[PDB]
Design a protein around this nucleic acid. Structure first.
Ligand SMILES: [Zn+2]
Ligand SMILES: [Zn+2]
Lengths: 127, 25, 91, 97, 151, 97, 214
RNA sequence: GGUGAAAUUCUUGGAUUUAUUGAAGACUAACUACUGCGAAAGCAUUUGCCAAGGACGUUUUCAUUAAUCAAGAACGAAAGUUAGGGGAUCGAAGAUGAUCAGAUACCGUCGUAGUCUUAACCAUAAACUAUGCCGACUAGGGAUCGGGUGGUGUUUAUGACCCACUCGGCACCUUACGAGAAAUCAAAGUCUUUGGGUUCUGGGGGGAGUAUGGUCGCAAGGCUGAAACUUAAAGGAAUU
RNA sequence: CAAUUUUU
């Protein structure tokens, strides 16, 4: 009965965003970002920001007629921490609470064959 | 003092002692 | 036997024109008319006729190779660029 | 390995180098097993096998050309083609392909 | 015809308009690359040996493979004559006298007790013929390469 | 002096290994040295799986688990892995805890 | 300004036929107005669907499929086959330490005018009454079987066009066949094909449209 | 955007994002280890060609053909050079944003040389196992790779394994009789109970791998290498 | 984030 969307969560550092789209995966819908739920910019990856964003993402998809979403978390990917952000469980849990069914979910973090030398340099990120 | 920068001094105050052999002589 | 020691090939200039220059022409003009081996004769008697020509003395079959050598650095990558390509446009 | 095989021919295999001799060996229809080179002129190439349709002899095309058949038979020059008119102790003439 | 060849074929002697008999990339050595096909309105995305992209139709001509004469410019001439014998069948463009040691009349730069141009060298396209010498309507001077496909 | 018996990093008679990349400060280190300790938990919250199984279609579907591994440097090793020091006699041990 | 969500076609998708029931989702595109109508709009997209709905299988929660879409017709659009790759969890739930890995491709010009790269993966276990940990084969058996990997999948393929090779992948009977050939050399753990990616769609192909429904 | 926190820079000309293709060149994840291979540096994605090397097997063969080496030689990470190709990512110099008193430093966003390839170069690195090369013997103990020999052995003759043994590896653990300054050591043992061969190096630290002389380089520089003067430690290990 | 000098 349920129509199936795909969320494609960008869970990373300094921000977090998400946009529901069709099961094909091109016609994008309702992409709220970290900068639209807070004006601080130092907590857009904090779970308070993804708490306000996820329920707005479903409510902007509610008048669309989105019933269920195959969400897809993904980390920072590429050549960084390879870890989901602090708001990664904050956009998932709030979307389940805001009245939207979830199914058939895993991640799409792009695993490389480790190459194209990372930034910082040889002697690491001194800090 | 790492001895790299003991060695960087003495290997370019050598040539300024050694580039007197082209202007003078 | 080995008449002079370092210049050799382009010693015919003498003492003029530089020496950073005539040790770069040394590296090229040895290639410019040394007898290469063109592959469709099984011999080595192909030499310069003009900047872009090569001509084998036997078998009388003149290629249209590179400027100074018989085949450039960019010539060996184009013949595998289409030989990358001539398969999958068919199969 | 075929490069094990044809090196054994020099023992007692009655063979002949050259082109006109290769033809003249192929003239009598007694000679078998024409061996050719890759970078031969192809207009020279065809009348080798066009006779060899009529004497039914196998012509194994060798994956190397003229200049690398020379050290592959023993002599020191650029031997183009090779006819094996007899190979009394061998393995080539049957086990090829 | 480039519409009948697939991606990435490094080509030459290609043509800017269909049916014109040769116009593009036929100098001594250089090539040209094709980077695809827009299917509808059958034009394509073509580079060029200085980096400016260009759009040309489907049925334009073109031969694959680079032009002979590779690496030619980098050996020095070493001789005034092999430049004079270079400019034998082209022009009387050789030699090129400099307009700074020139008389104050025959060139807009010369004259003085020293040899200084005084005015700027880069004069615009708003300037009109008989005075554009020096440098033709430009922005960046100084020793730094302008490279193609920057990061 | 000497402080570690198997001196640098599990390595005798191989000269050079290849370098690999730290994840906490982007450092390149020799591959045998730093640490390779895994990470496998789940993809859930503080569990909240009752919240999942009410919001799961095709019921509860996975208990969805993850995989990752970490390479550190030497500096952020004892800055994050809470060991920071070992006693003199327990340097010799090879205990997983 | 406009709220452009009331401009799409609340449209469907469809599955290929050689499966169970085929209504496999719904999409949202556009209106078919002038200036390149929404009829020939998409024509290239992919359906990132797992097999879990197309066969109802719960154990096949991995191997996400993508789907070639070509046509549209009468508030419907019919679909062709693209290939498959595993989910990113089910690889790394098997590659642990103290074993070896074998991967050996052979792309193959199939019956009709496609060509498609195919992969494999292998795993080694120790047949109990064991004492070892690392479970290696002698590095020539690796050399031996990874070439005979490259003719097991030159027998089922090159013949019998892939619209029934998908009827050979969903029971994984080729992965059953790898257990047959490597049964005496070095035995193995569970073997999968793990990848297939397509690269030679020839043409518009209205002739294969009517095959993938019924 | 990026950090602790912000500012560069980009963006209503559709950024960051989502899909579809496609290209450029680099690089070889997850398997990857107390493991392999090479004289050393180094060496990891497949298949083929060319030659080479190690270990074991033998009741095959030749009979000192041998160990080390001054002079002389082949190889030799990265950086750098010289000349072409290619030039993604990183990134000295530099630009530029925070930082503080200064930041042309750390941190940030860019970015030419180099990074990649071919030809000529340079002979240096903690090229560290800070353990020259060879031969004998001296305590154990369990692993582990490669070859080899057996067992009333499971699986499907077969191949992997289990056990017992042995060869040669790379290492580990116990222990000391032994060794030393200690830390430690199966070699750093068999050394005042001093002699198995054999190449090299050091005589306080400084000046200094400096001056002059020579030689090798296209240059950076490399090899060989003092004296004048100066002055009691510099130092190695270990307990509080 | 930033923490310097404190004197045979
Ligand atoms: Zn010829
Ligand atoms: Zn790191």
């Amino acid at each position: 009965s349920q129509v199936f969307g795909v969320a494609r969560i960008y869970a990373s550092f300094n921000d977090t965003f998400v946009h529901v789209t069709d099961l094909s995966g091109k016609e994008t819908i309702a992409r709220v970002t970290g900068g639209m739920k807070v004006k601080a910019d130092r907590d857009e990856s904090s779970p308070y920001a993804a708490m306000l964003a996820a329920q707005d993402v479903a409510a902007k998809c509610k008048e669309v007629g989105i019933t269920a979403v195959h969400v897809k978390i993904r980390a920072t990917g590429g050549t960084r921490t390879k870890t989901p952000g602090p708001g990664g469980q904050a956009a998932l849990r709030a979307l389940a609470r805001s009245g939207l069914r979830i199914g058939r979910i895993e991640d799409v973090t792009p695993v490389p064959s480790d190459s194209t030398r990372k930034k910082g340099g040889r002697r690491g990120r001194r800090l | 003092m790492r001895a790299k920068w003991r060695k960087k001094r003495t290997r370019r105050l050598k040539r300024k002692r050694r580039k007197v052999r082209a202007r003078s002589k | 036997a080995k008449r002079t020691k370092k210049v050799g090939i382009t010693g015919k200039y003498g003492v003029r024109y530089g020496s950073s220059l005539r040790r770069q022409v040394k590296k090229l003009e040895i290639q410019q008319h040394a007898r290469y081996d063109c592959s469709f004769c099984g011999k080595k008697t192909v030499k310069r006729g003009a900047a872009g020509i090569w001509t084998c003395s036997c078998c009388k079959k003149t290629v249209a190779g590179g400027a100074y050598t018989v085949s450039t650095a960019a010539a060996a990558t184009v013949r595998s660029t289409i030989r990358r390509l001539r398969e999958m446009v068919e199969a | 390995s075929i490069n094990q095989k044809l090196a054994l021919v020099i023992k007692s295999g009655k063979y002949t180098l050259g082109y006109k001799s290769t033809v003249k060996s192929l003239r009598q229809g007694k000679s078998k097993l024409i061996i050719i080179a890759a970078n031969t002129p192809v207009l020279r190439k065809s009348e080798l096998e066009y006779y060899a349709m009529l004497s039914k002899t196998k012509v194994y095309y060798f994956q190397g050309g003229n200049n690398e058949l020379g050290t592959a038979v023993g002599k020191l020059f650029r031997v183009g083609v090779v006819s094996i008119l007899e190979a009394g102790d061998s393995d080539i003439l049957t086990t090829l392909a | 015809p480039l519409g009948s060849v697939p991606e990435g074929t490094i080509v030459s002697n290609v043509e800017e308009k269909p049916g014109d008999r040769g116009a593009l990339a036929r100098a001594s050595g250089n090539y040209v690359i094709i980077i695809g096909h827009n299917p509808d309105e059958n034009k394509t995305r073509v580079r060029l040996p200085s980096g400016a992209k260009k759009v040309i139709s489907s049925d334009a001509r073109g031969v694959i493979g680079v032009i002979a004469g590779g690496g030619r410019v980098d050996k020095p001439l070493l001789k005034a004559g092999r430049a004079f014998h270079k400019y034998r069948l082209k022009r009387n463009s050789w030699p090129k006298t400099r307009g700074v040691a020139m008389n104050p009349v025959d060139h807009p730069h010369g004259g003085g007790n020293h040899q200084h141009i005084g005015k700027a060298s880069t004069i615009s396209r708003g300037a009109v013929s008989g005075q554009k010498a020096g440098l033709i309507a430009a922005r960046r001077t100084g020793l730094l390469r302008g490279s193609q496909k920057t990061q | 002096p000497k402080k570690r018996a198997s001196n640098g990093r599990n390595k005798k008679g191989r000269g050079h290994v290849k370098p690999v990349r730290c994840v906490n400060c982007s450092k390149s280190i020799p591959k045998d040295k730093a640490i390779k300790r895994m990470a496998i938990r789940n993809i859930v919250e503080a569990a909240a799986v009752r919240d999942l199984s009410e919001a799961s279609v095709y019921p509860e579907y996975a208990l969805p688990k993850t995989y990752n591994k970490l390479h550190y440097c030497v500096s952020c090793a004892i800055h994050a892995r809470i060991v920071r020091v070992r006693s003199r006699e327990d340097r010799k041990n090879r205990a997983p805890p | 300004v406009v709220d452009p969500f009331t401009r799409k076609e609340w449209f469907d998708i469809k599955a290929p036929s050689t499966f169970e029931n085929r209504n496999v989702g719904k999409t949202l595109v556009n209106k078919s107005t002038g200036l390149k109508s929404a009829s020939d709009a998409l024509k290239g997209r992919v359906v990132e669907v797992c097999l879990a709905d197309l066969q109802g299988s719960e154990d096949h929660s991995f191997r996400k499929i993508k789907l070639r879409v070509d046509e549209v017709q009468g508030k419907n659009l019919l679909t062709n086959f693209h290939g498959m790759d595993f989910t990113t969890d089910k690889l790394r739930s098997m590659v642990r330490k103290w074993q070896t890995l074998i991967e050996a491709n052979v792309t193959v010009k199939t019956s009709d005018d496609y060509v498609l790269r195919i992969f494999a993966i292998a795993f080694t276990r120790k047949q109990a009454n064991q004492v070892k940990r690392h479970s290696y084969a002698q590095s020539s058996h690796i050399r031996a079987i990874r070439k005979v990997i490259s003719e097991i999948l030159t027998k089922e393929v090159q013949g019998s066009t892939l619209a029934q090779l998908t009827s050979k992948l969903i029971p994984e009977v080729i992965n059953k066949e790898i257990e047959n050939a490597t049964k005496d050399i070095f035995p193995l753990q569970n073997i999968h094909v793990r990848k297939v990616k397509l690269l030679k769609q020839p043409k518009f192909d209205v002739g294969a449209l009517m095959a993938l429904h019924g």
